[PDB]
Design a protein around this ligand. Sequence first.
Ligand SMILES: [K+]
Ligand SMILES: [K+]
Ligand SMILES: [K+]
Lengths: 346, 346, 346, 346
Amino acid sequence: GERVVINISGLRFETQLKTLCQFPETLLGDPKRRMRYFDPLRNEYFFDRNRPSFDAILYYYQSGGRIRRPVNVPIDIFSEEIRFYQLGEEAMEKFREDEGFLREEERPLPRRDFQRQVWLLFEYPESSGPARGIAIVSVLVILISIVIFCLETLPEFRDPFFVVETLCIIWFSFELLVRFFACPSKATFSRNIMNLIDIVAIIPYFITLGTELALAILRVIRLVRVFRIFKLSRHSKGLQILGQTLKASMRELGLLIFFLFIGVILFSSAVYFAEADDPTSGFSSIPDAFWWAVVTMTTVGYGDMHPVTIGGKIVGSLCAIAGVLTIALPVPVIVSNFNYFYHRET
Amino acid sequence: GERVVINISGLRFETQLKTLCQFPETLLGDPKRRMRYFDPLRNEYFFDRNRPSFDAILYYYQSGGRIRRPVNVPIDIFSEEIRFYQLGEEAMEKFREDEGFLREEERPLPRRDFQRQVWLLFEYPESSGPARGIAIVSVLVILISIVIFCLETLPEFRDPFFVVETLCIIWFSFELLVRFFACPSKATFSRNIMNLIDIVAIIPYFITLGTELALAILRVIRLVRVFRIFKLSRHSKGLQILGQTLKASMRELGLLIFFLFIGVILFSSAVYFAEADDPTSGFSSIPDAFWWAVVTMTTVGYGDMHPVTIGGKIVGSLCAIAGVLTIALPVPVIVSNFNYFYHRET
Amino acid sequence: GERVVINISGLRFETQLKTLCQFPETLLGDPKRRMRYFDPLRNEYFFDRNRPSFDAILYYYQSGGRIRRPVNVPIDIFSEEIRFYQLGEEAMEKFREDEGFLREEERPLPRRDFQRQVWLLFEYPESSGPARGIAIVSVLVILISIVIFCLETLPEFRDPFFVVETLCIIWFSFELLVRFFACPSKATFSRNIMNLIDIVAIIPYFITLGTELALAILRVIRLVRVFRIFKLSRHSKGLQILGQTLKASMRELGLLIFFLFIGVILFSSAVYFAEADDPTSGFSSIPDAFWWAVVTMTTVGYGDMHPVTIGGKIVGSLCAIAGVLTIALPVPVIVSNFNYFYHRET
Amino acid sequence: GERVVINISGLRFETQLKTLCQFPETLLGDPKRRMRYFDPLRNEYFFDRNRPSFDAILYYYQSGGRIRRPVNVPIDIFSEEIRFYQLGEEAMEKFREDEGFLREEERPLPRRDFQRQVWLLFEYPESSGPARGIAIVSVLVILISIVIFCLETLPEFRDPFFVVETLCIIWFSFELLVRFFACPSKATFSRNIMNLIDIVAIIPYFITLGTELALAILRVIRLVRVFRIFKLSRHSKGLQILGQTLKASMRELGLLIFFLFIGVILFSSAVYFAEADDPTSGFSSIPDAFWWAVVTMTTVGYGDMHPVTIGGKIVGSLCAIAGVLTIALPVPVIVSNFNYFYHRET
Ligand SMILES: [K+]
Ligand SMILES: [K+]
Ligand SMILES: [K+]
């Protein structure tokens, strides 16, 4: 039933020896490290230190390791108070996990001299000079492949285009093979999103050459060749934050599309029933005002043609207001996700 | 005039025995449960516990049951401190009512073996496999009734449509009767909004069949058949949150419509008086610029036709600014109501 | 050099007798009211009370009347602690002036039996039944005068209109005379904004009748007859909050108009210089793209006609982005003013 | 091993004499200034003062000069507590640098009687009457030069314009020479942005006169004459805040333009591939839907012409939603920068 008096510069605390011996790897736990500060006469351990920090430290032992920082104590002061009390790296990364920093992982490096040099050359551009050369050459090759895609579909042209496209495909396949064979773990390579993007960027050229030298299919292939824009996400950090934002916000995008569908059916029905007994109106069905309701609710504008009645113009006024209301509701959640993932960098 | 000294790990509190005996059902109220911690020599009750939590607990007795959590104490720590002090379930749900959680109701179940099984089968879809089957069949029947409504009004057609519509009405009436006759309390059934929606979804078919086998009326009936979209609110949780948001925000919607009316009258008057002495302008009245002012203030756009004078274009510039200002003012209150009801789920 | 020990339920405070006698109208100031709580043996004044509240109360005397509420003490608890300490109504309305409530004025009533009855009948509608009758009759007369204004300017008509307009003017002048002759202070009557609005609502009828029974002038008079919409601000509380918002935000409205002017001159110059060597473009001057730049920056839309070059479409893309940026900057300050004046009601 | 007891009105603190002597220029550091408050009997220094402020002051010595204000202490109370403790102007501007006020610089004045008078006359308009006269004359000359620029390019005219333009250039060069020769430090003059703006405002007149009395070049010169709008930034404080905002937000503007480029390429590709097998569609290439995708994503509107298929209208619906999402993401960071630099004035 022995007690112990800990005096943090005038603010006197008291507890049991069991609570101090529950963590016998800290400053106050072992009976010899804390006799550094013991005063024989006053029977107390005088720590000329910080007082709100010590009431948080004393709660950590009582809570059996549950941790929190008081709201009136700054992070650096509390950090070096944890360090002074030598609570433990367990308690330190508990405090980090509690505050919410993502400082937990360090990705490995290949176990050889040759692999380490080519993997750090082709993967980490901040290292060397040749690394920045590979980065700038890669961004330029991606940009000219986009230009070749759009110029292919111009009507003055429809071969130099096949030669430029096959040079771009040679460079893409070359750096994909070099990145694959120089990686540390091949089990991780078929889980990165960017390596899947590079594979889908080089596939349709090879299947076109195969079936060409051996309706919906060829339209799918000509629209799947547009996924070479997403090869810029390796060199752009705002695009990676945009992908993280869009993955964290999938319920809000579904709600946006669902609310717009409900409003389009409702206001198309209303404007068609308001303009049926008028032979000079343009709405001939309810599936004919769908596009008018979409461009009125989003505020793009349908052009000169307008409802022609009085009830149709009252319905159009309500459609223009209701779209602003409908769209403005799930969008602050998506911009909060963006602000979170974006300022997480600092 | 006896005092009592309560020592929360060094932080010494003092009060009267009357204040402790005012709640004689707690830990400190009865004279035998709190002699667990009484120290005979120091004449104090040593609780090796949390200090800001205890100043809140000591205030609860003094305030005669008024409760609050200090701003520097987290909710779980204060919750188990209330639990340790055994303040009472009265004090615990007072603390819950103070913080503002809606954890108060549990809706009943029918008092029989048969009724409980069919009511939980047709009302709670998360229970069983047949429950999810009934849910998916119901959503599919609602969707094909919407498709039948719009395809009915196409002009290439205007019978398979009557057969599909009467099958949909048979399913709606069947599940309405099964939900009605299997419910616990029939006094609650004519107060849910969704049961009223189901009744209005099946009424106009039956009154059309009745008066057909026995202007504004038939137009009202053909526009009241569109309320089958709101039968999706039973299966969608975002739509229920949208209804709660729109009911909590009825003053702000009235202010939005009132501000837009004031602006439409004002800017229509101004643009007509700016373009009266010009024979090539299109505004022939003040009730002819109402629609131009609506689409300019909302930013939809009126199309190619524009004011034709210099004063008319100065008035149009001010209309385009004033609509943004007018609309942007009552909308943050509606999106705060949405964020409240939406994150209330977690 | 006498000290005094004040013991707030265990938390011991200490000060000088000079600091307590500096306010000798309070509980601790006079030497007989505070001997209610003095303990002769322990030489202290035991107040079984609230501890953070007492450190704020002890600071009030030291600061010579400067007051503040601690951030960890709620408003009702601190209010009744001020009341318990009987600091003074001076200190109580200092605390109210510090927190920022507008509970300071009570507007007078006429000093007679007859004047008090007609002034409360015609000014305060929440009193009686005839008061609500006068309110509803007034709103209906204002609404039919607005309808008469717009129907006057229709072209099928251009007398019942003169009879309806002269009945509306008789009612406006009647209630203006009754409100003027029944008011308590006639010095305040020519400072309310609403009485000036009523005078401007009845003036142009009388000057038209005078000069008619005795270009810019008559156009000014026909546009000054539109100020009868603002007679609804007496019966509407959202419109009064809108007027307070617009008066508090006059620097931000000037910045909005100035930023839009800078952008219109800049992008009109750029699009004209990008499309000068092309005979099929529509911009013939820099003062001919002013209206295109206004409707592109505000997002209303100019219609089918578009820049016709490549440099003109690059300039148009930048105009569409820059308007969103320019407009979005001074608008959160205006909506914060609105939220302040609007939630000030509760 | 001597200790010292400091009693802040009942709240007793304790520390070592080394910690107090570490700053021997303050109130508690020198052994004679603090014997003002020493009580010989109780062996303590009684400061009838503020208690949370003193725990912050005691931490300052322990942290070796690191400073912070507690979150529960207001700024004026803590300021005069620092002043009472005479911590030092070093500690006072450390506290100011910690809170984040920009009260650090005072710009010099010329070292002569004549230079000081003309520099304060032509640079500081708030001083005198002639200073405000120079300010109003300068703003009027800038405004008529803008009017001359636009009226020059009207087609009814294309000499009074050369005379008005040469008078404006004489005034600009005159005040530039007077401001240059009367300044204190000529090393600072070629680093202000506004003096560079004045030089670029007077250059192209002189090079036109030189090469005229001695394609892309003359188009560059006729578009560089538009930089006379930015001479209003000396007389306008909202424009200076806009320039500070736009310089602090250069990463967010690049992200806005990059996200819009990605979306334009994506939705142009999709709408062209959705409308290729239809001879009545208007999209003939992917570089022909670029402008439609820009005006649909920004909500300006493309006019009457619309996608003509069903897949094209589904793609157009997604384009109209995706632009709102894309644009709304980096814009709250720019408006937070604006609010910061704008309310920094108060
Ligand atoms: K538009
Ligand atoms: K728009
Ligand atoms: K349009």
